[model samples]
Target chain A: MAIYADNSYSIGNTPLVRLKHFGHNGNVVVKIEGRNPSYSVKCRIGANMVWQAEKDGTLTKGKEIVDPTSGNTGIALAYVAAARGYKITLTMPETMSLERKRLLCGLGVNLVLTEGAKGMKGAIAKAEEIVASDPSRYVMLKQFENPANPQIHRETTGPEIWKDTDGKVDVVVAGVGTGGSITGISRAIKLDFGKQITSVAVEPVESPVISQTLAGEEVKPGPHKIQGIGAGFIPKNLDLSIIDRVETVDSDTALATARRLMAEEGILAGISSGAAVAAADRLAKLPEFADKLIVVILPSASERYLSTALF
Target chain B: MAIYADNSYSIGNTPLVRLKHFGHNGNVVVKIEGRNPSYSVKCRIGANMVWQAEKDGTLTKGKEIVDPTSGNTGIALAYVAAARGYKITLTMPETMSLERKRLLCGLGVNLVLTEGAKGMKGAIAKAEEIVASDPSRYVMLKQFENPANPQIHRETTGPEIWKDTDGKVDVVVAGVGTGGSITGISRAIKLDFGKQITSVAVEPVESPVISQTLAGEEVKPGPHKIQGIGAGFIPKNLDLSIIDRVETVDSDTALATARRLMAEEGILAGISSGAAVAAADRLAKLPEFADKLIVVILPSASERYLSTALF
Candidate 1:
């Protein structure tokens, strides 16, 4: 049981741990998604996408996977594609940090650096063009719209939390990225426990796409410190209907809380994870949430954030 | 059952999975030590030392642990110290990479940088001076010389591999550092399986301490590319008695193999891990090792080495 069949089997079943130093009454626990193979929750999405494609016969052996990503998803895709017998090509603007480039490059990923003028959009366009060049050979799993992204969480992450907590979870806190994890989790908990469980979506204050969307305001996704939290536009996978509430955390506060989590609980989590935990900390202070079982998703490791200002 | 008692509980039981692309047959597997909280096999050493110290009452809650390390052991100690309610201070030369500094600093560790001119010895001297300054409150783990260093691997890592492989492991390949892991594993496998399992100590070709020790030649510990493999001198806990053989890998070959591993097998391992596997690749080609079950300890993740040339 101690041995895994291979690297793909190591993708999930990350730890759920109580953060003794953060909460009011030991009610706050964190699912450390950094324990995933690629050191981020994105592993679940990338792995599930490739896996389902293989299952559906859309992705045969030796088919290439092309995607526009500059962060954890790229690394996750690179890792899964390598294990599953697929060639992966990731496109990102050269303006992205060299550290990011190096990590992806060393993973034996074919990295295409697009022009900085168009930024990430150029990266996306380039990947789309590449896939178009050879439709039969190249398959792009557009993570933002992919059902498997959220579906994996609905089937695995959410149910695991349910089983782990013995059906006692009161609320789940997770930062909105592709909206995959939060949306999937929301679907699972609401389907299982109904009104007993609440799903609180977290966002950086600078880019509150979900919060702004819920209020019927213009969704302006500006730059924020948290890497995977907010997108410029709402992805199809982000089910706004299922999300019960939205909590916004500032960039500096997110970094500080991440540092504090490591300092106090020895949980080496990323800034986005800090954003969710920061929201959880606020929720814990309320009298209505007293002694409630709150679970927060710590998305990635600080290992990936050393070169960033978060450290 | 999925929840951990705390971060310290996540120290060991790393996965033993086959590196399907490397060896001639399906006989080579890797112990992914990056699964540890600190992302290295050194976690086993640092955690055990602190724990044994706690059990023996030498380390009370308020005590401070000081060590001369800028590498994995420092991060490991900081992580365990934060979790178990102890303060940690690490000393390193200013010449160490900023990436390494940011990681330790963000972990809430109190860091002291010695002069770059004196290198690691200055770091060690500074730590000793600090401990001497306040003997009552400061405890130095002194990893290289500590018995608990190798003792943990002997008790935990070695036994886990043995049980995981169902007592069928024929060879174990691990890099020599503080010599904790290789020494501990060698003690365990030889004690249990006797000559049935061979422990191959790996080192960088540029700085082959154990090989030199075995040859009774002058031990010249020159600067090498691998971070944790070879020390300038023989560490006290290296336990040369049980080690069956020594194999040295070149720097560039180590980096190349590490990259190949990620590209082919999806194992995101560090450079020293590559060194051992590179050695494994050589062994697997030979007629004698054709059917041998080789298990290599992939000590850390490539995430930690992105800032280095290894990427």
Candidate 2:
């Protein structure tokens, strides 16, 4: 992918590759998200959100750009905002990578660190306070609730998967953090491929959403090592009707598969990608999924999380 | 590049991108080494060295691989060796990335870390000692002195640059740790294009070779932040004859340019590539070199050094 300043094209049209040694007897195709602009799959979401906001006139006359994110979103927003010549402020958890902080700072993104225990809620509260206090002075492209968040995958990623797979994709496995990927892509898939495509949402084992959506019980929100693809709350843009199945993946599975991908296949994928792959592998192994083309949408790359994953 | 256990094709042929931003008015190109199989330029040397050893009958019958490296080389060697079914013993400086250690360990590469303060020389001595202790037990692809070290670049890298630039490349910029890249490529370029192509080498300002070779004054090497491109001693395979000029780059400039490449060009190049680009920029401004296409080779991607660089 060719990347220039302020250009969203840095997010590569990720190559659909066959799992070299790890693929099942059936053709297992995995999207390499590590190839994206920020080296993660979030470039699409970031680009889409900003562009959509600009198109909708919400940010057309603003002096400040604001977003609440701790991981890839903050960094992606920082890069996009820097390129677009906007004064940006980001509220994120303080416990994330120092690299993330440095990168955001290097891009001149004003950062506000929230308490780690307070998690993303505190960050969101801070960002909302900033937006409410200033209103028109600051344009907050709230990624969690933004319609453009998932619309990115719907318009770009979902269509790519549907057309690239020739509409023969039986299962679409994705890790849900923002729920943008699964909801938007699955919605688009259903719009085109209908019920033939099974959209499977992979969530962290400890996800509160898992308790509510998977176990039919409510659970508390907590932290997980896997970044960029887990959520504490359901966003407005997430359409639960588009999801067919949800699977919970433990941290151990995510770590183990991340290591396996790097060692066995030489694919340095992020932990979430590993979770998605692990979930996809499990889904493909089911007797019902035998001989079916299993397409896993990898949303991000591993470069940002190399230290976390490699160590 | 989509890589796999059995995939042999996606190893090299990384793009040589120009860093117009770094060079200012001058032309500077980077090899984008991070584009290699192992996400480092060392993959080229690692894969080529092993294959050359096999061809030279040094490890024809039953050769176990043993070599000394910093970290990147060991990782690259471990990757290729594992793919080729060769057991490898890698002697490395202990002060590198834990992820690197884990990857090599996961790949089944036997690792022996040198004592503190010895740097690469200690690792080399340890590797040589191991080879001597088990003469028939292992084959050492001594990258420092191996004739095949230069041959790999001579055969592939040299031709690629010449063809890529359509024989218009007036200057080729590279960083030297092993001297293989500069030496090999310089030899090939001189053989084909003669005086038309100038090979420029970049070394650390604190490195002994820089002051010793350029200033003709002995200087002790100090610790430098840049990885994989500076050495305390002149590598045995270094071909000074092929080098027309040498420049010493400070860690600050290298780091700053690396950050700039990521920020401005969206190029995730390693520290050395930044140094090479910095050097190429200087060379491109020379009175005789205006408008000449300068090719800079980036040895690896930013994946390995992201934590250190980003943080």
Candidate 3:
């Protein structure tokens, strides 16, 4: 009947759509996370984080929920806060798309804008500053460090992928923002498949912090146009051991792939989803994974990235 | 498995969510049409119209599909056209939100703007002008008059709602744009329920053409900030006989209801959806519907209306 008690119940079980236009003869299946109620994969974590905090006595009735986000997380968190009767304050770069700012404001969220030059880092600094100013008044659900962020994926998203693919999933490709998606999904998949599934993480070529961090090099995060992923630093929740490979894709390539996905496959997903698809395409072309079932996670919709250079 | 060949295949079978915060002891169930592939109820009709045209040999590969739309239909048609490998031209008022224009352009749809003061009527006139210039070069899927528009709803949306509600629904509420949703859904529900279900149609108080038309008064299609509905004319596809009641809601009431829906029920639906809810809320308070099961259709997401004053 597809009946739900509330919108939060509609967070998971997104459609696993086969890519007919790309990949090895439609072997690559994309888990369209944009189909969630909040139009992003972060909807899962947003509900999880908020409920977990409530259970642990951190997120109270009157306390304000605070977070630093580029777009998706803020939107998701705003949705969660609105539903749960909590006031939310999202810190984002001043340069973020007007659509997102308007959407968050529509949900009655207090937006704290930081310098665009400093990117997500400056937003994070601003969020910390707000919480530090009045510690008891606000509770920061730092998604980058929260175990619940990844925990929800392990509980819901990971299990759905495995069950939907009938345990035949060979590789999982996803872009990392808070690293929660990859880490949690990989943990659950690996626990079930016992290293049979290869987990590949994607990052912007401009800011290859995960790749650089793996190589024991001093990390230098650069500016990138991709909205959700490559947040300058390696997120604390990202379990490096679970990710088998880290692939880098440029913004142009990602945007182009995103456009192609809509034009050819009818999947209107965001740039980070395009990056995941690009990574999946790369893996699909390899001789070793010619016939393997590769599952790619499309995080958000292309509509969200319309204000940017995605078009 | 929730597996789909393409996004078009994922257009229907939207969720039927129980409205917990409203109606007589939570007897209200909302069919969230925003859960469709294109994030709007029009996705079903868009695909249906195009495919029906292709069957009748009206929509060919080389021929461009043209349509006059304010927002949702244009976006849905663009997605369908892009997927099916057809070029599309959408005629919209210049005053339409920047987000809609950017989204349509992102899908490679050609946008032709009309006078903002003239509204959707101006866009329709412009569309006719373009198609008349080269008769065989372009095919206009006029949603206002298209039988395929409501046929899909009767075939898909109505059946789904009936099945999801376990055939216990006593009321069906929806807002009218082209009147396709109400016409089709009411036809299906009444056919099954045999007049046991009351179908209510909602319109903007600013432009109450349906109510005025029923009242035998001269129709005056005026301006309203609500984007999708209230086209200022009684649409040809709207079957008035199927609608048992006509309710009018102002922009302020609709927007406020939409905001309240998001805050209380976690349903971030558009202004027209809010209008639907407003009508449903009015119906729920009546003694006749005290224990009856009411199904309100939320046409699209609030994210689409973020650029407007709906926030």
Candidate 4:
């Protein structure tokens, strides 16, 4: 059971584990996505995006890829592209850790660094400019808008929870970045499984774009330190029709909650995972969810966020 | 089936994957120890040591643990101590990465950092002094001297490999840090499986402690950047008679081999894993092992070594 053809074959089916200390009313469980091959949840989307591109004839032998962001998506893409024998170019801000730049380059990625002053915006701009210059030479997966992103989650991630929990999962909570995960998960559980499930999206309190947009209010995005979530803009991949509600968690609470999970539950998941569990706990106290079983997805481990201010 | 009670139950049973590029003459398969719950192989010993202490009544609920390294062992122990409801104090040099320090501290470890100039010797010295000052207050699970470290490998790691590979393995290659892994693995495959599996020990070329002791030569220990392997002195847990031979790999080659594994086979294992595979390749080139299946063990992942000079 613990044998694989290669590392690339070992991508999905991460454990859906029960929580003891941090779950709401002792009924919440966590899907350990950090257990994926790349140690992040994005590995699923990375593989699916590449596979879909191949299916659509966009990715072929000798074609190079250029992606914008340098977060877990970049990390996942670096490994996926390398394993599949394709060259990749990742554009990231100079402010990104040398740890990241070195690892990505070592994976044989042609890493292009923009000015640190410009942050992720400069990185994205540089990538867009490069891709726009030569359409035939380079390919951009465009994770923000890719239907494959959410499609993979609907196909694999959501189905795993349905089968593993024996179709008994009551509610699902997750942090939304591209909104691909939450969108696909809600669709699968609600449509495929024919189960009534509450879907809650978590975001940094400082940036309330998703919730504001839903409320028909002015969407003012602000900055926050919670990684992998709290995007400045709503992603095109997000399907808002099925999402039940949005919960906002602050930066300090997100960080402290991660620390508490590590200490109390011995879960070494990242801050976004902490924020999701925090939102789950808050939702658990509501009367409507008195005995509901909440399944929260933890996207990554604590190893990646070491360079952050969690110290 | 991708379900678990909690994080503590997800420590072992890592995937044994076939390598398309790094293996020698296409006959090498890697046991991906990095797939363990803590993202490192040392989690096995961390759990076993604590479990052994509990069984022997040396460790109780109120007891605290003190360990003397900041590598994967420290990371493994931090999670284990937290999960098992024990206080832990880890001693490391001040020069250790802020990422490691912050993560451990966030796990509620009492991190006592010595001066950078003092190095690991300084950290270990501090731990010993504290234990000596108050013998009953803190328990030191001296990994170098603990028999339980290797016992865990024999019980689980070895049997898992034997079962997964269907007892068709010819040789085992692994790096020697505390020597627990190689020793226990060799003992299990030989004594229990009744198989004649050759055990090959890997170490840094600069430090040849295990090989030197076997060759009747003076062991001259030197510094090397290849982590998790190569030691200045022979460990008590190391079984010298069982090891067939020693293969030495330099630090640069170790790092480069790991890079090649990532690029060629999509394996994101650490440098020590590279050293083991490098040794396996060399052995594969030998005339005696032209068609034998070598199972090389990868200790940890590339994520941990990002702060090092891997760039």
Range of the 10 consecutive residues with the lowest summed lDDT in candidate 4 chain B: B1-10
Model 1 CAPRI quality = medium
Runs in model 4 deviating more than 4 A are A1-3, A115-122, B1-5, B93-95, B115-119
What is candidate 2's lDDT per residue for A38-114, written digit by digit as tens? 55667787788878888877776456887887577776776566545567888887886676677777666788888
Native A-B interface contacts kept, per candidate:
0.69, 0.09, 0.63, 0.65
Ranking by DockQ: 1, 3, 4, 2
Tens digits of per-residue lDDT for model 1, B127-217: 9998899898999978888899999998989998988988888889989888889888878888855645888889989988788878999
Work out the TM-score per prediction.
0.95, 0.80, 0.92, 0.93
Poorest lDDT segment (10 consecutive residues) of candidate 2 chain B: B1-10
Which pairs clash (backbone N, Cα, C closer than 3 Å) in model 4?
Answer: none
lDDT of 4 by residue, B1-311 (tens): 45566666677777787777765556788988887667888989988888889899888888889988888888788888887788999999889877788778878889999888989889989999888877777889988889999998999899988998888889999899999999999999999898998999898989988778788899899999888878788988888888888899999898888989887777787989888989998888787886888899999988888877555
- Tens digits of per-residue lDDT, candidate 3, A1-311, equal 56777777778778888887778887788998988878899999988999899999988889998888747777788888877778888888888777777778777788888999988689889889989998998999888899999999999999999888888888999999989999999989898556568899999999999999999998989988887899898889899988899999999999999988887776788889889999999989898988999999999987677667886
Candidate 2: fnat, from 0 to 1?
0.09
Q: How would you encode candidate 3's per-residue C-alpha lDDT over B60-103 as one tens digit per residue?
A: 87999988874788888888887788888888888877777778
User: Candidate 1: what is its chain A TM-score?
Assistant: 0.96
Question: How does residue A193 of candidate 4 score in lDDT?
Answer: 86
Clashing pairs in 3: none
Docking class of 3: medium
